Amino acid sequence: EVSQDLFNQFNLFAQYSAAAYCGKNNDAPAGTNITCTGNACPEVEKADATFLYSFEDSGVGDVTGFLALDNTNKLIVLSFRGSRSIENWIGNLNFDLKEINDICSGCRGHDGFTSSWRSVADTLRQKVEDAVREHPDYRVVFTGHSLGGALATVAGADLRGNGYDIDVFSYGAPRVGNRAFAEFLTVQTGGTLYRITHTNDIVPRLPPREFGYSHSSPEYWIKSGTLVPVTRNDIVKIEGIDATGGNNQPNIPDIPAHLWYFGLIGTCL
Amino acid sequence: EVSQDLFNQFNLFAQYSAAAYCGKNNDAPAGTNITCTGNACPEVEKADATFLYSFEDSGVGDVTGFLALDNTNKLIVLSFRGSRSIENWIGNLNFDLKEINDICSGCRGHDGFTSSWRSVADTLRQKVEDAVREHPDYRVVFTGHSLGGALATVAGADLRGNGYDIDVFSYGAPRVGNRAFAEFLTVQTGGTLYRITHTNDIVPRLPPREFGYSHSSPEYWIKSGTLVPVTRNDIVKIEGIDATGGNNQPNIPDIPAHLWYFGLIGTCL
Ligand SMILES: *[C@@H]1O[C@H](CO)[C@@H](O)[C@H](O)[C@H]1NC(C)=O
Ligand SMILES: *[C@@H]1O[C@H](CO)[C@@H](O)[C@H](O)[C@H]1NC(C)=O
Ligand code: NA
Ligand code: NA
Ligand code: NA
């Protein structure tokens, strides 16, 4: 029921997110073309997409990802990588909230996600803002899978309202904060959040509701199976804060579902 | 190009081969229903399929796999796993040939694959023949991916001509021996060998021709990409021993192509 155009953008930023794991970018200098192993990001590769800045283990939270310039789609893309060990990351996630009044009043955010972003926020804002000054008609997009989707969502909330819109596309993202933060991410001006979940993926059900967490609205829930191709009629737009009957269902969730967002993600063949 | 029936069998044996890696078969008792993690084998789970025998690190060559009864498809399936570390195996694979005149005259086979089979041949033959003597109507199929596909091929060549057809479905198998063995596999009565390859998969390119190896004919070559769903029209039948222009083409090969045969294989989400 989503337009072909939105389905194509969902595909594209799933592959920018996938490229944060699989991108041939160990020491890739600025200006190198973005390429991946294992057909992880073919639509990225078709674009005129280059690395503006790569980072690995940055700040106190050891944040990894890259800033890209895409002259085909006219994008400035900040892509954050999830964990290198997702099963261990999932099973060892702490659920502590901290106040984040400097992002929204009465908002509380995951201590790790919000500390990791704060630690790199000055450096990454300046990189993004340099790119925007150079290409003021390009669209700014923040994206990521898993922990990277959390970091993208926190980053977006914090850097919006500085005269360029920031759209956020997250894939399998955990809850990032309390109901006031979910409410803020629902309504915040200056950019859209496209929060994409898949079947019974455990990560978007963590941290739990009973640790004081809430999801933002809306959710774009992929109903097609693990290792199954996604069609346009497989995505369901579900409205409402902590809406049930997309990913937030009372059934038993799984980790393989987290690794399949329009193709393989969070793991590299 | 192939029939819809054969396309469905291709997909089904790809999942029996995947099950050798992702099956919940760890000291699993006989009679247990076959299930996989990570949606590896949904067609196998749909079927009334159970374990007749599991084996792990069997013989000198540490051969791993299972014998399955399938009362829906009327099958007896002997599925061999490939390596637990395929990249390590590819890198460390030696090319030594050894006399197999007891299989066919003037045939030479890979030392490791033939020795690994020979070590387990008596026990597994007994298992197969117990299933045949209980279900004489059922189709005997040997299958496997990677090293498992080579073991299924050698096992087939050895055990045919004892009163039951043995069909072999191999996925990304390496060459198994010399031109004589290749010709024997092309023409051997008592079953069909379906040797399936995918795009530029590295493993069917090993050992190299230059070490005295040939492929059997024909080859079913999948020309759809890594992480792309396979259509019936995406399989080409390629005739001739050491035919070029399926997998045997002069381009750079890669490992991810090995792990995508109708779906994920050789790794478990
Ligand atoms: C880098 O991508 C650009 C734009 O797509 C292309 O013109 C150039 O050939 C690419 N570089 C290499 C080394 O392929
Ligand atoms: C085993 O599979 C059969 C049908 O294929 C079914 O009757 C039975 O419930 C299954 N066993 C379990 C433990 O689910
Ligand atoms: Na490119
Ligand atoms: Na908005
Ligand atoms: Na079953």
Author numbering:
A (entry chain B), B (entry chain A): 1 to 269
What do the study's own words say?
Initial hits were obtained by the capillary counterdiffusion technique using 0.82 M K/NaH2PO4, 0.1 M Hepes, pH 7.5 (C23 of the CSK screening kit) or 5.0 M sodium formate in 100 mM AcNa pH 7.0 as precipitating agents. In a second step, we tested the compatibility of both conditions with the use of agarose (0.2% w/v) or silica (2.0% v/v) gels by loading the capillary with the mix of BioL and gels. For comparison purposes, we also determined the 3D structure of BioL obtained in the absence of phosphate from crystals grown in capillaries with sodium formate as a precipitant agent. Interestingly, these crystals also belong to the same space group, P61, but diffracted X-ray to a resolution of 1.7 Å, being the highest-resolution structures of TLL determined in the hexagonal space group and deposited in the PDB. Besides the great improvement on the resolution, when compared with the structure obtained using phosphate, chains A superimposed with an RMSD value of 0.34 and 0.49 Å when superimposing A and B chains at the same time using STAMP. The advantage of using a gel matrix media, e.g., agarose, is then exploited to: (i) produce homogeneous batches of crystals (500 mL), (ii) facilitate crystal stabilization by chemical cross-linking, and (iii) to obtain high-quality crystals (allowing to determine the three-dimensional (3D) model at 1.7 Å) and to facilitate crystal recovery.
